[PDB]
Amino acid sequence: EVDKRREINNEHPLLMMPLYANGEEFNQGKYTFWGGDTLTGKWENIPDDLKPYTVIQLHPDDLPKRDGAARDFYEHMLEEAAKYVNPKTGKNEPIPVILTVYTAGNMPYHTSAHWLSTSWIDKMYQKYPNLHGIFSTASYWIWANDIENKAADYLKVSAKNGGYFIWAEQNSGSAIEKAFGKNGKIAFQKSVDKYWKNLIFMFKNTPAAEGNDSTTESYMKGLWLSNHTYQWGGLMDTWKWYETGKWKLFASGNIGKSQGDRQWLTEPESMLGEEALGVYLNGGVVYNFEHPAYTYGVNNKESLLFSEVIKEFFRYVIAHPAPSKEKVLEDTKVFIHGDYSNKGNGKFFVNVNTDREQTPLYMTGRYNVIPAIPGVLKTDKLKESVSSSRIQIKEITSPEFSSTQARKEYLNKLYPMNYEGDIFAQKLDNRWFVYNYKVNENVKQTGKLKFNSLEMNVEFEPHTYGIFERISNGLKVNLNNFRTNKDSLWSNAQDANQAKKLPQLTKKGAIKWIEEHYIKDTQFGEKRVTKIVLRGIDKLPTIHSLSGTNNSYDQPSLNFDQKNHMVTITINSNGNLEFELHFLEHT
Numbered sequence: 001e002v003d004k005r006r007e008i009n010n011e012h013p014l015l016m017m018p019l020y021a022n023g024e025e026f027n028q029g030k031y032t033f034w035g036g037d038t039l040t041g042k043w044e045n046i047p048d049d050l051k052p053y054t055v056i057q058l059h060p061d062d063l064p065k066r067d068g069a070a071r072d073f074y075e076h077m078l079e080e081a082a083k084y085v086n087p088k089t090g091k092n093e094p095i096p097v098i099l100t101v102y103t104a105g106n107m108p109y110h111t112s113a114h115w116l117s118t119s120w121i122d123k124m125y126q127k128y129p130n131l132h133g134i135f136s137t138a139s140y141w142i143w144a145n146d147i148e149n150k151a152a153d154y155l156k157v158s159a160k161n162g163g164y165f166i167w168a169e170q171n172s173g174s175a176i177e178k179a180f181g182k183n184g185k186i187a188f189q190k191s192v193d194k195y196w197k198n199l200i201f202m203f204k205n206t207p208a209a210e211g212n213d214s215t216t217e218s219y220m221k222g223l224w225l226s227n228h229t230y231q232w233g234g235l236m237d238t239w240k241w242y243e244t245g246k247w248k249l250f251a252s253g254n255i256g257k258s259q260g261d262r263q264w265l266t267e268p269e270s271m272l273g274e275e276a277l278g279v280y281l282n283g284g285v286v287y288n289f290e291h292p293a294y295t296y297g298v299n300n301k302e303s304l305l306f307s308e309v310i311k312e313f314f315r316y317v318i319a320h321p322a323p324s325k326e327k328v329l330e331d332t333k334v335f336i337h338g339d340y341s342n343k344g345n346g347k348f349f350v351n352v353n354t355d356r357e358q359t360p361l362y363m364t365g366r367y368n369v370i371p372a373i374p375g376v377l378k379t380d381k382l383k384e385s386v387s388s389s390r391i392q393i394k395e396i397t398s399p400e401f402s403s404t405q406a407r408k409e410y411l412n413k414l415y416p417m418n419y420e421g422d423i424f425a426q427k428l429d430n431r432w433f434v435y436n437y438k439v440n441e442n443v444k445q446t447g448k449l450k451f452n453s454l455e456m457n458v459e460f461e462p463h464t465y466g467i468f469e470r471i472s473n474g475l476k477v478n479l480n481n482f483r484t485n486k487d488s489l490w491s492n493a494q495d496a497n498q499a500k501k502l503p504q505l506t507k508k509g510a511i512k513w514i515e516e517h518y519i520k521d522t523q524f525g526e527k528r529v530t531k532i533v534l535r536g537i538d539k540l541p542t543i544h545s546l547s548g549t550n551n552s553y554d555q556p557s558l559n560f561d562q563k564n565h566m567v568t569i570t571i572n573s574n575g576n577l578e579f580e581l582h583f584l585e586h587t
């Protein structure tokens with residue numbers, strides 16, 4: 001084993017920071033990124049506490065489809081990253097980089113990345129110590145004849161150099177199963193056997209109309225737990241709103257895939273945090289997002305989605321490392337072996353822990369994410385673990401998994417019910433994680449959670465998540481319901497028929513919209529109410545360390561009922577929010 005170029009694990013998570021090459025400006029002799037970020041400017045503006053955990057991911061986007069274009073662009077940027085000088089100290093501090101080397105099956109009619117050989121990649125790894133890995137993304141829809149063979153070579157060249165091969169893929173058309181050798185292409189399977197410690201596998205939730213969210217994330221988790229990948233994560237993509245044909249928030253009717261650039265702006269900001277929780281809460285540690293202009297920002301500035309949701313969330317997972325592989329293994333009661341493609345794909349979990357076929361969210365944390373691996377793999381390395389002796393390893397073809405009812409009946413006997421209410425909740429140590437699981441329906445949800453004898457009832461509007469931690473002197477609360485008003489994008493359309501016929505915003509139009517109406521002159525959403533009720537309280541709680549998104553919240557209201565030893569907390573907000581409540585329990 002060659003020394004790893006960086007650590008990626010629960011204590012050292014990874015936020016990938018995408019920069020998409022501007023192919024049009026490249027033809028004009030310029031080296032630039034769509035959205036106006038610059039390599040140096042972007043890096044400098046990453047907060048210093050995040051710098052150790054963030055890596056610039058170059059993507060060749062629409063660079064010309066011919067030999068030399070991607071190499072030329074990439075070498076230019078690697079040179080800039082390598083020569084970076086910290087202006088605060090004057091020292092040369094090379095910027096860590098990942099190169100996107102494979103995408104869209106590397107078809108010469110799809111991507112300039114086709115003309116990046118393994119020899120060139122080896123050469124860059126040897127020249128640039130700051131090149132930490134290479135990235136393959138989104139070939140599920142164009143599964144090239146040699147994709148597994150190429151993947152094997154990418155992992156091996158990364159291992160050779162101590163870097164990481166990162167592959168983001170969704171289980172559309174059995175992609176994850178094929179990658180590990182389902183259809184007899186076994187080169188990557190053999191590669192993984194030798195080099196799994198340099199592999200990161202992520203979901204890519206883009207193709208949302210196919211509903212493979214739950215099954216792909218299950219695989220990513222199970223691959224990790226069974227030592228087929230070093231760590232896992234997900235790429236969470238606001239393009240899901242386009243794929244599923246949604247338009248104005250909560251509006252009725254479906255417009256299909258007809259208004260791409262309005263659509264990828266519309267996903268509520270806080271909902272990305274809800275998606276990211278499914279990674280964190282299940283031991284995943286790698287995070288990436290599209291569309292980059294909305295999810296990260298433009299012109300070296302943070303978008304509000306980034307500043308108020310993603311940055312906060314990522315800081316959270318650094319401060320509170322995700323459950324270790326050992327811990328997840330200890331908590332795992334069922335591990336599935338077999339192919340979800342032969343059991344309805346995403347339908348497998350519908351009305352088990354997901355509320356519909358097309359959603360990136362869960363409706364209960366009761367089973368958290370049930371881990372699985374494709375039928376083609378073996379559970380040998382899983383069973384070798386000191387931490388796996390209490391796991392039921394089951395074939396997906398078992399009668400326990402044959403229908404929706406059978407799955408719930410079997411899982412319920414092994415995963416006890418641990419809260420009440422129709423709402424998402426999952427518990428980790430002294431922390432309750434809660435979210436409203438509605439995607440595009442304006443319906444409040446409620447739940448009742450317990451910290452031993454202390455009862456906490458919550459009421460949440462859609463696109464709201466909370467983390468509630470029982471601390472020695474009370475309760476720490478982190479809340480996030482940040483959702484700006486996107487209606488202006490859908491103005492002039494009173495129904496789906498008219499919405500579908502709006503003039504295209506276009507890629508350039510959307511980037512301009514972000515600059516003019518999101519980075520500034522933002523149409524913030526209305527403050528909305530969250531209720532928290534605590535029962536079993538001695539005296540009126542006191543509030544401490546209250547902060548949140550600037551100008552986004554009213555002072556929380558506490559109403560203590562002495563006779564019933566209970567407090568009703570009413571919050572009116574739209575943003576991120578944090579405080580502590582200090583109290584003693586009534587005994």
Ligand SMILES: CC(=O)N[C@@H]1[C@@H](O[C@@H]2O[C@H](CO)[C@H](O)[C@H](O[C@H]3O[C@H](CO)[C@H](O)[C@H](O)[C@H]3NC(C)=O)[C@H]2O[C@@H]2O[C@@H](C)[C@@H](O)[C@@H](O)[C@@H]2O)[C@H](O)[C@@H](CO)O[C@H]1O
Pocket residue numbers: 020034059061062103104137138141206207208239240242243290291292507
């Ligand atoms: C769901 C799916 O499989 N779609 C295929 C395309 O892949 C992605 O799909 C998106 C629509 O859901 C969208 O077209 C993505 O590209 C736009 O957004 C990115 C940033 O998010 C860039 O700005 C792209 O330039 C832009 N494309 C256009 C035409 O303006 C697309 O994601 C991109 O392409 C894939 C292959 C991968 O490289 C991603 O990392 C990258 O962001 C796919 O591109 C399309 C091509 O014909 O086919 C769809 O079936």
